[model samples]
Target: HMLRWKHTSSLKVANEPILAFSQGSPERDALQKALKDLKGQTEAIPCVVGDEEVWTSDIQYQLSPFNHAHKVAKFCYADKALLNRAIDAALAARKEWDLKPMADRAQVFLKAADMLSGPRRAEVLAKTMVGQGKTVIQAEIDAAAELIDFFRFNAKFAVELEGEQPISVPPSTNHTVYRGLEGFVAAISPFNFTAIGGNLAGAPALMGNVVLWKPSDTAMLASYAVYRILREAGLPPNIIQFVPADGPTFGDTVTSSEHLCGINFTGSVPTFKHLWRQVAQNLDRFRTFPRLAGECGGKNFHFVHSSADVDSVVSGTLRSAFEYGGQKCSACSRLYVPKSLWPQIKGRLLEEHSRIKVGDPAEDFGTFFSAVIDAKAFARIKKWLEHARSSPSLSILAGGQCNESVGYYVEPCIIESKDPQEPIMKEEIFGPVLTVYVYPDDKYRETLKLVDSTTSYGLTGAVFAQDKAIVQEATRMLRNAAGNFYINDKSTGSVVGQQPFGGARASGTNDKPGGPHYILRWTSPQVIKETHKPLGDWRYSYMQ
Candidate 1:
């Protein structure tokens, strides 16, 4: 078949794989049908079974915080050298790709949306489930689906910008027309998802610019598979280069290259900070003043008001931390629950926690938890849980136990604390461990104080309350407290197209993506004017 996906057992030789198309919603049933239709069309060539592989082995760890289930097949690790080859191929392809018209680039991006939404959806989700150690559920599935949406979103946004006519101003003048910036952007992605790297690069590509992408080496296979899908969808070779290698080398290749114009990054704060320094120090060689778009480390917080709906707060808190094993940058680490509401809130939270199924992603019983990326992350979370217990005022309400049977797993941990200043309360644990603090006062001022005094790091956070005026007031106070603030909802699940995603403080620059704000961040406006040479346009120089 022509559009076969990567990381599959078949088709080692990469010529563009044939993509199987489906017009319906990319649901599970729809996927099963699409695969079957393709099999019949190919004259009984057996289709690859989605469940054929009894995935019993562990995925390789990609990052340091692999406290979740993220083991992979051995072959992916064995083929690590392909990263350089992938990068080389992408860079080589980029030379000509950068010259394509913005509208045309947007067209190619639309094709990528099709492939991601149709043929490769299930396969990528499976990889995400095992690779990121997430359950094959909404969160993991949605992340994969959003990969397609990212392309679609940018395609529309890019086309609009490409055709946009710049507003004119007369400063003694000649008429002026502005076109999109013609530069190249390099995107370095993290391992949390399969396509965030592509999303970063796609943003530049949509602007008639090209991209040099180097995905997390650990996530190279999934990343490579995505590249293949993009290629199949009509993404020209060289226009978007995929360079997979060590972080430092990847950083060096893109940052040091004269052609590299801008960079979009998603990872740890330290890594981004280093990249920032390097770019700042070497500004002259690049074409454009290189732009940096990043979504870095966040210590998200959640405040539970005394009048907040008890059930809503409990469920939201658990989902905020446990969803995706708290691997997300927006996951809440510092939590404030009123001291008066602690007994009732803790009971409901622990009861809900008890119902959460913890184990294999494939299992139907699996509900609340899945494996951390690997044992290392599992150990880190364990260490933090131990330290959280150090607070004499805290209590372990539920699943703090580590299951050693088949995968790296840490159960949802609920802690009780009276002091929000406890060291554990301020730091980002990046796991399913949830710490609950009780405030003695019933006032919103107390909640505000907890939000303020807890941590210096602020990214995304939420305040739970029922009263309209109270919610609005809390929102106003906590507005500076978060880049993406929430109300009566889990701070974890922020939709791509609707709410703008990012953090403030140490979180990021509040460049609200999925909104016009994010698009503007990648752009730097330049003003130009020309007069019909009424008195010789060169006369202005003499007047000066």
Candidate 2:
């Protein structure tokens, strides 16, 4: 076997620096200007199949979640036929894209990272703020910092991955060729994080797989901007076709195609399950096994111990629960606090909650977070809030009001539940709703078990404890409770390379997207061996 691996460059990779949009800052001015540009006129989004811009007769509007009267973007969904056309375009582009040197592929993403962090920073941040209802800080963390980080890090990680080779014998050399998936990858992104939309589509593309990117119906404005930015950074058209599509039509069309190599998804559990079922049904029809990489929703938690720092718990929980309206997959939905510290924590939490201003992010720089993503999201969150009001075991502690007349605004609510096993404690409320279960301090161990068993999700979790023994105990007891575990920190705000996020069980496949192993999912490796000298006796040693 012959080992032959050459690299052009090991690009230095780091997390993208977040812009501080302080008053009178350049980022603030630029982003606000970009927001004004978007709010001035509704953007017309079209599906891209190869080089063609597809505008269907059936039009749809993406309304700003914080200001329902205004439209953030206008678009048309790619029906089954258009989706098939996208699939064909992706398949045709795969060979050339895959054959390109790994370093060549990496450069495009590296350049894209530079472009996103530099020139297009304000545009994406503004679009994410206006179109996805994220406050400036939230949108900056997601659209600007994290998305740029994903691009830079993925490229660096992919090149580093290519440097791995197998050992060779005396006259033989062995190496592994990381081949892209046999066919096209269907990248179905969600609305919560603009970075996730970019990562869901960008990761596989960086690894040389052709992608049919179906961005979320609600987050098209920011996602489309990323798509265009990728193209401008030297990504060939049809290498990643932009296909905004209906969930079912896109899912069914992609899963049924013979050339479907993989499905890269970040969305709800039910939707992921739906796609999995389709893959299972058409299992035999596919050319490959059809890799399914999904980062699903989470019912994340924060367990506050009696020894925890009260201030940290209050601040961390507030940020995790209410920042970005608790729309993050790793947001703290369930809180387990000891009765010993409940009063202090509750007092502080309520005081902080009172200061939280929920409004349109585009209109007010003072707003903490805007409304939830869309009417569907608003309705789902509203249902949980209504249940909180009606439930006997649950009491609203603060901010339980929701107004949908003008915008789908739901105040960041704090619900205290006497029953730890209440639906609010277990189910995922992807809104600014935090359910607190005050357990007796003596039953800390028991409460840890309750935290573990309360939700099937194993996405992200944290335990606030100053005592080393309690921290160790909680860490061991809740080992399988989270993929990204936090100690004395919030569950959300996981950095790209630092945390390398994903979860196990129902949450996801635990591929660790930002880590070294994630790109492995998009590649099907093949081992190659070259003989440096002719074999004189193949079986002589064995026979002797």
Candidate 3:
């Protein structure tokens, strides 16, 4: 039986504070225990198809980015046959899951958030740190804090979304109801943020939609843990089908399905566009128009004016560009600095780079730097650095070094590009590489235009200026330059409720996840009208 609906006051989600690894703190001790427990454990991860745990002969190994030789876990790859079963499972679950009371759906997610925040947090964080090469702090923020915020805040958003009602007429009453998508959602998540994987799958599920969660292989260990957490929280086994497979194989199988109603994705631009194109090509196969929600590539930037605070600019730039090895879609790749402040910014950035200790996060909780996800990323980043090192039009101001003897590690490199239109400035390298273009102090306005037009991406960027007038001008000029704009801070680290994260242009569909509208994408709203009385005769006064 459906419970009576009631309006509940929605409060903002309090962000989970990052745990500092002080000696013998509960979090630190828990983290150490988790790491020790998972060390060299060759466990096999499987897909959840309906109530069945499905495994295959096709095996792919999960390795640590910090030390590629270390094997932590493995997953069975789902072929077309397995994918078909997973899709059918989601569709079957959707019939029951979507019809349940909204509160029932909400309860499952709220419980999941609680479970993730409590018992599952340490293991998940450790998996993220080891499997994804994140430092303890990074894992805490991503695998723990941000993910918890997404669940708690998304629940609140779903409740509020359901609260919106149409204005009622005196004689006739009008009501509005939100329904989940006609079919299951395909939640294809990125490797960068474990929170994203959960949100991509969980958000649609909160709206009473079943999900086909396809996590990136690099981040599968943490993603699988999230799957376990959700199940532990009382989500029915069939609600989310965890399908871990190659993107091409998965893409072909999933997109071809008539049951694929929507896709929630965060990844490279090429991949998202490819998915978009594939969906378009297979549009006739689908029962309804599939909703496409994506957050893709970025050549995000930070512009520093002469009137900006030097300390803030330096620190913010470094953090935005280098944190998480520049894997974030919002990480700053292009840098615009006033010629007058260039020397100072350069000197300070190099000085700060020296403080960043790169190694195994297991060795030191304080290690701020780590290896790139794989050899492909290392090669691509090295190619860019090598080009910059040899190019007459560019100068390596700080670091341009790579060492792959043990793991794929590249020193955070800073390059001064003579041309604003250089390949490094326009392309999305997805690495710890920052390209700086110094302009005359008087060219702030011109530089703003250049920054806006430099890349097809408009994911994130920041303007650091103390002068209110300059700030306002830059804000106005670069209005459409970035979706998440910053005043004096870095462009990254957009909080869930405070700054709804997403972008326009080449970056994504600009659905603005974490905002009220995001949940609407997963739902289909319907309107109802009821008249208090029915007339026997239908004759207008004018006709009479």
**Cα lDDT of model 1 by residue, 334-367, tens digit:** 6787777878887787788878877655433245
The best candidate in terms of lDDT:
2
Cα RMSD for candidates in order? 9.6, 1.5, 1.9
Order candidates by TM-score, high to low.
Answer: 2, 3, 1
TM-score for each predicted model, relative to the true structure? 0.80, 0.98, 0.96
lDDT of 2 by residue, 157-178 (tens): 8988877877978677777889
* 1 against 3, candidate with superior lDDT: 3
Query: Could you arrange the candidates by lDDT from highest to lowest?
Result: 2, 3, 1
Model 3 ranges with Cα > 4 A deviation = 1-12
In candidate 2, which residue pairs clash? 1-173, 1-529, 1-530, 2-173, 2-530
lDDT of 3 by residue, 104-174 (tens): 78777788877877788889999998888888888888888888888888888887777788897666776
Q: Mark the regions of model 2 whose C-alpha exceeds 4 Å error after superposition.
A: 1-9, 537-544
Task: Write down the lDDT that model 3 would get.
Answer: 0.86
Go through the candidates in order and give each one's C-alpha lDDT: 0.62, 0.89, 0.86
- Candidate 2, residue 282: lDDT: 95
